Amino acid sequence: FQGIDKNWMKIMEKAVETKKVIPCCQNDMLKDFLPDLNRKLEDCQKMLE
Amino acid sequence: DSVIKNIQQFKEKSWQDVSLAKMEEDAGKYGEQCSRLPKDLKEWQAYRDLKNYIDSLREQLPLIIPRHWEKIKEITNTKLNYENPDQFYIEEIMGALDFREDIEDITESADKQLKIRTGLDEINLYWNDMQFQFGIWGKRMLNGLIVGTILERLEEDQLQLSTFNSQRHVTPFKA
């Protein structure tokens, strides 16, 4: 979650740069990471629980 | 003299070259009413022919009143008329039946196609104009305050697009 949060820190650093809806939907990095980050968060969620 | 006074009102309507909507069906109708009982006694076939020409213009004037207008010109025997003529058409629109009424139905369809295309162009603007609603989290970054409002639009537009896809007039802009 130290590392995980960085990848999420950078996604919201990329959100300021390009803010429009159609871009954020089609944006390369942000489309690919949300599925990966979700499994990474869910595994740390279940481990906390 | 009344038959020549109708041929002049037609030449005047020809010189006008502007969408005829009201006055054309009125001028030919009012005179033809008092001409029908008179033309049998009057005989003079040139007057009855002019009254027939005045009636056909009164019919064509209601039919007369973009890509759909160019497609309209195409199925009437005319080429960039609804372009160059709707601008300044002497008597090309007036001159140009079942093949006419079938053409009219192909333009009303082409008019419906464009009205859906404008509806899709309206969608394209609001997706560009909108920007993901970023809200405070402290900056100890920002986050989507309302995704549900954008989700409502997604399904609404997907349903509108599915509703358009069911219409036969979607096919050109279906891609």
Question: Within 10 Å of residue A1's Cβ, how many Cβ atoms?
Answer: 12
Phi, psi values for residue B143, rounded to 5°: -140, 155
C-alpha–C-alpha distance, residues B93 and B162, integer Å: 38
Of A8, A13, A21, the CB nearest to B131: A21
**Which residues of chain B are within 8 Å of residue A16 when distances are taken between CB atoms?**
142
C-alpha–C-alpha distance, residues B53 and A38, integer Å: 78
Asked whether the beta carbons of B31 and B2 are under 8 A apart, the reply is: yes
Asked whether the beta carbons of B104 and B63 are under 8 A apart, the reply is: yes
Q: How far are the Cα atoms of B105, B137, B172 from residue B56, in angstroms, in the given order?
A: 20, 74, 35
Of B131, B143, B150, the CB nearest to A20: B131
C-alpha–C-alpha distance, residues A8 and A14, integer Å: 10
Indicate yes or no: CB of B131 within 8 angstroms of CB of A15. Answer: no
Which one, of B74, B67, B111, lies nearest residue B96 by Cα? Answer: B74
Phi, psi values for residue B75, rounded to 5°: -90, 20
Question: Within 10 Å of residue B9's Cβ, how many Cβ atoms?
Answer: 17
Q: What determination technique applies here?
A: cryo-EM
Nearest CA in chain A to B139: A9
Nearest CA in chain A to B141: A12
Which one, of B150, B154, B152, lies nearest residue B130 by Cα? Answer: B150
A22 CA: distance to closest CA in chain B (Å): 6
- Chain A to chain B Cβ contacts (< 8 Å): 25
Resolution in A: 8.0
Cα(first)–Cα(last) distance of chain A, in Å? 15
C-alpha–C-alpha distance, residues B92 and B138, integer Å: 71
Alpha-carbon dihedral angle through residues B134, B136, B138, B139, given to the nearest 10 degrees: 20
Helices (H), B17-137: 23-42, 45-64, 67-74, 84-88, 98-129
Indicate yes or no: CB of B132 within 8 angstroms of CB of A15. Answer: yes
* Residues in Cβ contact with B32 at an 8 Å cutoff, skipping those fewer than 6 apart: B51, B54, B55, B58
Which one, of B132, B19, B169, lies nearest residue B86 by Cα? Answer: B19
Burial class of residue A20 in the structure, from the number of CB atoms within 10 Å of its CB (0-12 exposed, 13-18 middle, 19+ buried) = middle
Taking any CB pair shorter than 8 Å as contact, residues of chain A touching chain B are 8-9, 12-13, 15-16, 19-22, 24
Beta strands B142-144 and B134-136: pairing type?
antiparallel
Indicate yes or no: CB of B127 within 8 angstroms of CB of A22. Answer: yes
For residue B72, give both structure tokens: 């309209």
* Residues in Cβ contact with B132 at an 8 Å cutoff, skipping those fewer than 6 apart: A15, A19, A21, A24, B144, B150
Give B94's DSSP letter: T
Of A8, A13, A19, the CB nearest to B132: A19
**Which residues of chain B are within 8 Å of residue A24 when distances are taken between CB atoms?**
132
Asked whether the beta carbons of B120 and B173 are under 8 A apart, the reply is: yes
Over the range B49-70, which residues count as b (16 or more CB within 10 Å of their CB) and which as e? ebbeebbebbebbebbeeebbb
For residue B33, give both structure tokens: 């009413």
